[PDB]
């Protein structure tokens, strides 16, 4: 009978970076999705494998809310089958993904006049990430034909690069908050239901 804590997810004060995205397990509650779609705050509300209108009528199990902050033109990369820095090295969605990607502009919270430097993306990884795999490991990596055995060789590249968030930036570079809801369609007893 109790409500699901979407307020603790969407209306949180701080979001984690896309390399270290926050995963919250939502279970044992009634989820009212009608306050999400009818809100005009969300610029992107794209659901794969389920219609958003039907979200109230279905009972899910193991609902996951994945929250992070990415820039404006990378929101298209939060989709199945997309390529880019975020899809390959930061946050990968499976090909058989069922769920919803919700993203909204957060320029008035996540930008500072001198530049906000709290959100960082994994610029490079040795291989592409597996679906729903998190890489919080920050490791020094080499450059080519010379090893990273000190300063002696070609200087060693760092994987994590911070976003330059300023309020004067044009759209597409502005901070966008992304919450990815992931569901499972009726296998074990369902714990998250609509009204």
């Amino acid at each position: 009978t109790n409500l699901c804590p979407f307020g603790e997810v969407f209306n949180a004060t701080r979001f984690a970076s896309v390399y270290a995205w926050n995963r919250k397990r939502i279970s044992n509650c009634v989820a009212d999705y009608s306050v999400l779609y009818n809100s005009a705050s969300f610029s992107t509300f794209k659901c794969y494998g389920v219609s958003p209108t039907k979200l109230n009528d279905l009972c899910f199990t193991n609902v996951y809310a994945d929250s992070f902050v990415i820039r404006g033109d990378e929101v298209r990369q939060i989709a199945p089958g997309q390529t880019g820095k975020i899809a390959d090295y930061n946050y990968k969605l499976p090909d058989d993904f069922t769920g919803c990607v919700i993203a909204w502009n957060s320029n008035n919270l996540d930008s500072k006049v001198g530049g906000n430097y709290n959100y960082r993306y994994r610029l490079f990884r040795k291989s592409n990430l597996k679906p729903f795999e998190r890489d919080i490991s920050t490791e020094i990596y080499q450059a080519g034909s010379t090893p990273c055995n000190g300063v002696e060789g070609f200087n060693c590249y760092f994987p994590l690069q911070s976003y330059g968030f300023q309020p004067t930036n044009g759209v597409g570079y502005q901070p966008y908050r992304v919450v990815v809801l992931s569901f499972e369609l009726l296998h074990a007893p369902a714990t998250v239901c609509g009204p």
Epitope: G114, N116, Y117, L123, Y157, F158, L160, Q161, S162, G164
Partner: nanobody, 119 residues
Amino acid sequence: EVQLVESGGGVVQPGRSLRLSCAASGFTFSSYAMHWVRQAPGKGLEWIGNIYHDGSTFYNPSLKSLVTISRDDSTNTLYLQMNSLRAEDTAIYYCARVWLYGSGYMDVWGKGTLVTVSS
């Protein structure tokens, strides 16, 4: 020209604090992000921390609460406070500089400082 110099190394007791300084000369300290890296004898390089112009400090998940990165922009210097020194922190420390408007290339490096912990 561009130059990074460090100070604060020596032989100290374990658990006593240290303050390693990285002075930058020849370039404006802004618009670049500063890194602290250490390498142990017989081991490869290990990244410690990052600090930006905002004051956002990012640490390695492997080591927590041992270090504190403190930037200062009046005199273009970078400070590291090391607390609760363990025996395994014997290492050569390096100060690194990345440009914020490019890939994460660390460009010029500090010469390094030696920290030896003993009992």
